[PDB]
């Protein structure tokens, strides 16, 4: 299959309650594998998946040093952004960064990513060319000009096409038993009377990995997109995910409805019905 590595940085100011908190987590697909928290008693980049534990002390030292530096520098960046928006020192603000790379089945680069948000609003993003940026507003233009002057895009391109994909390939091999294993959804349809006139049919998918899934209902072979209640895919706590899709059907018409399931772990797509 195809795969991604992503790092997620969050920096949150909290005036009157110390300096801004910095958190960094790393993922391969939907698997968290490292974490750092500046509020920890002894801040350190720490393992969160078994296959990263075999990296040596030099690995942990580097990753921790980077995180400790970013704790400091993201506090500078938050001060800068406050100024860019003429904001008071009294308010709490958030700076988020996502970056990393995607590869296909052959391990080759599909594309790289580096983008940021301030107070939940898109701020700046590296374009798919890994050579230029899209700035959201005149504040982010200050950052853009600063990064252009420092030849940041060239550096990001070198990381994204080089170390990012090299590490991701290493992780995929060291963790191949889990990271390159897709677990199909376990599926069933439940029936919940609402009234004499109607009932809910709920199509369940459980125990699947990765999280990406397609769960739909059809009536007489037509998709029921507008009339389907679809909950957000949710983590079970054992690495796997859950989802369901529901439709309200008139009493006695249940066999007109089919649930369809697509997932990487399945030999082929499933079609399901209520089976009283």
């Amino acid at each position: 299959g195809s795969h991604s590595m992503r790092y997620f940085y969050t920096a949150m100011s909290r005036p009157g309650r110390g300096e801004p908190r910095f958190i960094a987590v790393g993922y391969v697909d939907d698997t968290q594998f490292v974490r750092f928290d500046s509020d920890a008693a002894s801040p350190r980049m720490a393992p969160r998946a078994p296959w990263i534990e075999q990296e040596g002390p030099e690995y942990w030292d580097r990753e921790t040093q980077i995180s400790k530096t970013n704790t400091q520098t993201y506090r500078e960046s938050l001060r800068n952004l406050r100024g860019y928006y003429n904001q008071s020192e009294a308010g709490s603000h958030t700076l988020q960064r996502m970056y990393g790379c995607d590869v296909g089945p052959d391990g080759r680069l599909l594309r790289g990513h580096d983008q940021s948000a301030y107070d939940g609003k898109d701020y700046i993003a590296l374009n798919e060319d890994l050579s230029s940026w899209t700035a959201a507003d005149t504040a982010a233009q200050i950052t853009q000009r600063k990064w252009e002057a420092a030849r940041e895009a060239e550096q990001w391109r070198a990381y994204l096409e080089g170390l990012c994909v090299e590490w991701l390939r290493r992780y995929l091999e060291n963790g191949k038993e889990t990271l390159q294993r897709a677990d199909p959804p376990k599926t069933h349809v439940t029936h919940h009377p609402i009234s004499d006139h109607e009932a809910t049919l709920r199509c369940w998918a459980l125990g699947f990995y990765p999280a990406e899934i397609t769960l739909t209902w059809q009536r007489d072979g037509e998709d029921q997109t507008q009339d389907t209640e679809l909950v957000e895919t949710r983590p079970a706590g054992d690495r796997t995910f859950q989802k369901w899709a529901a439709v309200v059907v008139p009493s006695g018409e249940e066999q007109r409805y089919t649930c369809h399931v697509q997932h990487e772990g399945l030999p082929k797509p499933l079609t399901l019905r209520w089976e009283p």
């Binding site: 790092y7 960094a24 790393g26 690995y59 580097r62 990753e63 980077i66 995180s67 530096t69 970013n70 520098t73 993201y74 500078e76 960046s77 800068n80 952004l81 700076l95 970056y99 940021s116 700046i124 950052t143 600063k146 990064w147 420092a150 940041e152 550096q155 990001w156 990381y159 170390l163 990012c164 590490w167």
Partner: peptide, 9 residues
Amino acid sequence: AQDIYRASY
């Protein structure tokens, strides 16, 4: 593994 720090915002 992470990229290194180089530039603030």
